[PDB]
Design an enzyme around this catalytic site. Structure first.
Site, PDB file in Angstrom:
ATOM      1  N   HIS A 262       8.965   7.424   4.423  1.00 16.80           N
ATOM      2  CA  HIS A 262       7.951   6.913   5.021  1.00 16.80           C
ATOM      3  C   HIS A 262       8.003   7.442   6.421  1.00 16.80           C
ATOM      4  O   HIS A 262       7.656   6.974   8.005  1.00 16.80           O
ATOM      5  CB  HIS A 262       8.465   5.364   5.396  1.00 16.80           C
TER       6      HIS A 262
ATOM      7  N   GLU B 134       0.713  -8.558 -10.017  1.00 16.96           N
ATOM      8  CA  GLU B 134      -0.145  -7.773  -9.836  1.00 16.96           C
ATOM      9  C   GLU B 134      -1.378  -8.765 -10.710  1.00 16.96           C
ATOM     10  O   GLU B 134      -2.247  -8.153  -9.702  1.00 16.96           O
ATOM     11  CB  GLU B 134      -0.630  -6.400 -11.152  1.00 16.96           C
TER      12      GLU B 134
HETATM   13 ZN   LIG Z   1       2.601  -5.580  -4.443  1.00 16.81          ZN
END
Ligand SMILES: [Zn+2]
Ligand SMILES: *[C@@H]1O[C@H](CO)[C@@H](O[C@@H]2O[C@H](CO)[C@@H](O[C@@H]3O[C@H](CO)[C@@H](O)[C@H](O)[C@@H]3O)[C@H](O)[C@H]2NC(C)=O)[C@H](O)[C@H]1NC(C)=O
Ligand SMILES: *[C@@H]1O[C@H](CO)[C@@H](O[C@@H]2O[C@H](CO)[C@@H](O[C@@H]3O[C@H](CO)[C@@H](O)[C@H](O)[C@@H]3O)[C@H](O)[C@H]2NC(C)=O)[C@H](O)[C@H]1NC(C)=O
Ligand SMILES: *[C@@H]1O[C@H](CO)[C@@H](O[C@@H]2O[C@H](CO)[C@@H](O)[C@H](O)[C@H]2NC(C)=O)[C@H](O)[C@H]1NC(C)=O
Ligand SMILES: *[C@@H]1O[C@H](CO)[C@@H](O[C@@H]2O[C@H](CO)[C@@H](O)[C@H](O)[C@H]2NC(C)=O)[C@H](O)[C@H]1NC(C)=O
Ligand SMILES: *[C@@H]1O[C@H](CO)[C@@H](O[C@@H]2O[C@H](CO)[C@@H](O)[C@H](O)[C@H]2NC(C)=O)[C@H](O)[C@H]1NC(C)=O
Ligand SMILES: *[C@@H]1O[C@H](CO)[C@@H](O)[C@H](O)[C@H]1NC(C)=O
Ligand SMILES: *[C@@H]1O[C@H](CO)[C@@H](O)[C@H](O)[C@H]1NC(C)=O
Ligand SMILES: *[C@@H]1O[C@H](CO)[C@@H](O)[C@H](O)[C@H]1NC(C)=O
EC number: 3.4.17.23
Lengths: 184, 596
Positions: B487, B357
């Site tokens: 998805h 992150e």
């Molecule tokens: Zn990521």
């Protein structure tokens, strides 16, 4: 010498409606500002700041600005940009000191201090030390211009100051003390 | 009174309005995500309505300038992005039906639950529930029962809606002067204009085919090893030469093979690396983890974190007083506001997610100077790839040993390396055929090559030809298997993952070679290298202002996707697989079926 009313005021003005405060008849001893305001930025393009106490001034003008963070570097001789070309222009032989400092604690609101505007559009250039307050609708095409709406634009756009912006968007108050020694 | 100046002025107005509007929307979304309150939902709905209305209105004013008169190569991309009819091509009833069917599909997938037979008071949802059964159970009949059930109740109830969804999507795609909706997704990789850097929409398919045609032998050897290893857990349920049934793969759909590490471990006597004990003995908190990540990132010359980042971002869950959704996320609210949201506990996995992150945040901070429409990745693959290269670099034993988290006399041997390589392989290499097969099937359906009454006859053959998996029970036209995926039920592309997997290893090899590494690739650290930092930064700060080919050339040096690093990263694993399976059967045949 009167600086408390300038450098510790209540409210300042937008960039397009800048003041030209006149300061006169005193001895320039601004050491009080060193202690009262911990200046992060201090650029004197003329004589040395230490030697500024050697000679006094008569017709110095000062300005009241509230601008962004990544905008103060544009306030310099020979620079270009939106602000330099449309709001405030400095001369090449500019003899003065530019002073700026952060003002988050008194110029921000949660909803937004939507009280500062800045010029964005113009079909012309500016000249050094010019002030314009025109609010006439701006034309972009050949057709006659009637109010806002289509391509015609109002040549004034506002800032969006908020308390949790980054350093590059928080307001810095710039008072350009352009004391020209030869004319003072 | 020319036209390009008027277009430029319109862009100038749009840039200043959109910044404030998007900031308000992002701040409202952040506040809602931290807390849970009904009036917060109302405020988020109002803010999203304002943002959408502003975007729709500003789109209309941009249609006055035809695109053909522009000679700038920079405003052209912004105008092309803005000039696109979002959903205005369709009629009002068409939009109503499309939104109805999309929301209906999302809700149907969201609230799926299954009840065990003869037990009306015993029902399980999909998550939690079937996921726990698939991921941590060694039983046989129950897995088959769940695999048959979930598909039986879901596909037959979702196929007819998907038919109309496909019809309407194709109608809109033809309305927007495209070929088909698959072309609409393929258009994201399209770059037209500058000479020497053209990339047509149709070239991606050929590139994918050619690139996948090379890793197949490695997948074959790995699959043979897996089939050989599975003979100890399922002695009387695995075909000696057939394909692996899909109901024993440790997942509902077979996306990853990670859950097989403890069953196919090469040398199980020595355990793997886990640094928890030293972390506990020094009383570590989230602050130390994040400052270590900051030190690692600044070691290569990249900037630090903003002063406000340490203040406005929460690092641990507040507790029962509040109620948030624990899912790691890096937020780009704009105007110098970057925050990280993650519920942290002292474990190696979170220590790696922190690096992932923070790399995301650095990529966001790189391109802050570009205009608003240009502030994104070069394409839909660079973002997680830049995230993951740091994670790959930071978990090697050499880096842990150097930073004092491990014993200074720690002797690294050549015995754990095979285990590490197999653990990485079972989650990186074993997923490419699945993605390739699903995208191939979806594009074939959108183009229309597969008749409606012959879907399964090609779907189940593609499985045997690519993934090497065979269905355990016969199926008729009632079933709609692919729709069960997250998805697939929701409108989302799937070809991002293949590009990310190929790009990350290319980036790693380039940085390691420019970083003066000695030895195989798997023991490389990108630390201590301005040479590998400036090279990466020359790509980070471009944003979307340049074609992605040129951005790639500044790092890799070649302007096309390459596959050599993916095979290079697994050289000793390939050698060991070649040595081990000399006395076994190579390849899979479609002859054995459990029902016949
Ligand atoms: Zn990521
Ligand atoms: C496509 O259009 C854009 C927008 O008009 C062009 O951007 C402009 O690029 C020039 C450099 O080629 C920039 O000039 C420099 O500006 C700085 C101040 O920002 C000044 O100190 C320098 O002396 C110089 O004038 C210009 O600012 C920039 N304009 C904007 C609004 O970004 C771009 O060059 C065009 N591309 C092509 C291929 O012509
Ligand atoms: C970005 O991160 C670096 C590394 O953490 C920061 O470096 C900091 O640099 C200062 C100045 O050298 C360090 O302070 C002290 O400097 C004197 C010498 O002037 C030295 O004798 C002291 O022992 C001490 O090193 C400071 O410790 C150092 N690290 C930290 C944690 O701040 C840099 O300031 C950061 N800057 C930005 C833009 O975020
Ligand atoms: C600038 O002006 C403000 C407003 O007059 C000053 O604020 C006062 O500071 C004194 C310090 O002892 C306090 O006792 C007062 O309560 C403050 N304001 C009020 C409400 O009267 C400030 O000190 C001035 N400072 C400078 C830089 O000159
Ligand atoms: C969607 O975009 C197309 C762009 O081709 C718009 O097409 C126009 O259609 C009208 C009616 O046929 C013509 O007057 C225009 O000249 C066309 N424009 C161009 C550039 O071809 C279409 O109107 C858009 N649909 C919307 C905004 O609802
Ligand atoms: C890789 O980075 C580490 C970061 O610490 C470097 O370590 C320092 O290296 C100097 C070399 O003289 C030692 O004096 C320090 O004690 C080291 N700090 C430590 C170990 O925390 C390391 O040298 C770098 N790699 C290379 C090959 O130079
Ligand atoms: C600027 O000029 C205006 C004129 O009305 C006055 O009201 C204001 O107080 C002045 N302030 C400064 C900062 O000089
Ligand atoms: C979240 O909720 C808590 C309690 O309901 C409140 O104290 C806190 O201020 C809220 N967060 C924000 C950003 O307002
Ligand atoms: C390590 O190297 C030796 C070299 O002879 C080799 O025999 C051994 O198989 C290698 N790997 C392991 C797991 O020890």
């Amino acid at each position: 010498c009167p600086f408390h009313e300038v450098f510790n005021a209540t409210r300042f003005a937008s960039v397009y409606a800048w003041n030209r405060t006149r300061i006169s008849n005193c001895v320039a001893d601004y050491s009080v500002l060193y202690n009262f305001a911990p200046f992060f930025a201090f650029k004197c393009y003329g004589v040395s700041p230490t030697k500024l106490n050697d000679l006094c001034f008569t017709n110095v003008y000062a300005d009241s600005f509230v601008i962004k963070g990544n905008e103060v570097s544009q306030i310099a001789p020979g620079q270009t940009g939106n602000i330099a070309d449309y709001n405030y222009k400095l001369p090449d032989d500019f003899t003065g000191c530019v002073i700026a400092w952060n003002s988050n604690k008194l110029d921000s609101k949660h909803s937004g201090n939507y009280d500062y505007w800045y010029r964005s559009f113009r079909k012309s250039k500016l000249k050094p030390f010019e002030r314009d307050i025109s609010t006439e609708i701006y034309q972009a095409g050949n057709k006659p211009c009637k109010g806002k709406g289509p391509n015609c634009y109002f040549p004034l756009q506002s800032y969006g100051f908020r308390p949790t912006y980054g350093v590059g968007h928080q307001p810095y108050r710039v008072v350009v003390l352009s004391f020209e020694l030869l004319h003072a | 009174s020319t036209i390009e100046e008027q277009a430029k002025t319109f862009l100038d107005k749009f840039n200043h309005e959109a910044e404030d509007l998007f900031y308000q929307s992002s701040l409202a979304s952040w506040n809602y995500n931290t807390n849970i309150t009904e009036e917060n939902v109302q405020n988020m709905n109002n803010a999203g309505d304002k943002w959408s209305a502003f975007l729709k209105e500003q789109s209309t004013l941009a249609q006055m300038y035809p695109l053909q008169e522009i000679q700038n190569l920079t405003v052209k991309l912004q105008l092309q992005a803005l000039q696109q009819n979002g959903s205005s091509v369709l009629s009002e009833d068409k939009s109503k039906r499309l939104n109805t069917i999309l929301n209906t599909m999302s809700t149907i997938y969201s609230t799926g639950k299954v009840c065990n037979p003869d037990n009306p008071q015993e029902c399980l949802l999909l998550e939690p529930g079937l996921n726990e059964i698939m991921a941590n159970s060694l039983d046989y009949n129950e897995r088959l029962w769940a695999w048959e059930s979930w598909r039986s109740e879901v596909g037959k109830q979702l196929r007819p809606l998907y038919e109309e969804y496909v019809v309407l999507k194709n109608e809109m795609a033809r309305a927007n002067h495209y070929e088909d909706y698959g072309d609409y997704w393929r258009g994201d990789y399209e770059v037209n204009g500058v000479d020497g850097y053209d990339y047509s929409r149709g070239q991606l398919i050929e590139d994918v085919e050619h690139t996948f045609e090379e890793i197949k032998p490695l997948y074959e050897h790995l699959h043979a090893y897996v089939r050989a290893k599975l003979m100890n857990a399922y002695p009387s349920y695995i075909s000696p030469i057939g394909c692996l049934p899909a109901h024993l793969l440790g997942d509902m759909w077979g996306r990853f093979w990670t859950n097989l590490y403890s069953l196919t471990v090469p040398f199980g006597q020595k355990p793997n690396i886990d640094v928890t004990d030293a972390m506990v003995d020094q009383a570590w908190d989230a602050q130390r983890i994040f400052k270590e990540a900051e030190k690692f990132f600044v070691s290569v010359g990249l900037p630090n974190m903003t002063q406000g980042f340490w203040e406005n971002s929460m690092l641990t869950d507040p507790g029962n007083v509040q109620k948030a959704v624990c899912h790691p996320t890096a937020w780009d609210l704009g105007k110098g506001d970057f925050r990280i949201l993650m519920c942290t506990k002292v474990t190696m996995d979170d220590f790696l997610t922190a690096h992932h992150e923070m790399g995301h945040i650095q990529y966001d901070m790189a391109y802050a100077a570009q205009p608003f429409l240009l502030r994104n990745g070069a394409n839909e693959g660079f973002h997680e790839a830049v995230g993951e290269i740091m994670s790959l670099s930071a978990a090697t034993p050499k880096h842990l040993k150097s930073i004092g988290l491990l014993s200074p006399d720690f002797q690294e041997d050549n015995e754990t390396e095979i285990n590490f390589l197999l653990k990485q392989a079972l989650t990186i290499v074993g997923t490419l055929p699945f993605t390739y097969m699903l995208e191939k099937w979806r594009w074939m359906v959108f183009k229309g090559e597969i008749p409606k009454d012959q879907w399964m006859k090609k779907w189940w053959e593609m499985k045997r030809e690519i993934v090497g998996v065979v269905e355990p029970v016969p199926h008729d036209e009632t079933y709609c298997d692919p729709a069960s995926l997250f998805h697939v039920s929701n409108d989302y592309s799937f070809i991002r993952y293949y590009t990310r997997t190929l790009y990350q290893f290319q980036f790693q090899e380039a940085l390691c070679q420019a970083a003066k590494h000695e030895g195989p690739l798997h023991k490389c650290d990108i630390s201590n290298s301005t040479e590998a930092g400036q090279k990466l930064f020359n790509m980070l700060r471009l944003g979307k202002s340049e074609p992605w080919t040129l951005a790639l050339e500044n790092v890799v040096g070649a302007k096309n996707m390459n596959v050599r690093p993916l095979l290079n990263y697994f050289e000793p694993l390939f050698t060991w697989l070649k040595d081990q399976n000399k006395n076994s059967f190579v390849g899979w045949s479609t002859d054995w079926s459990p029902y016949a």
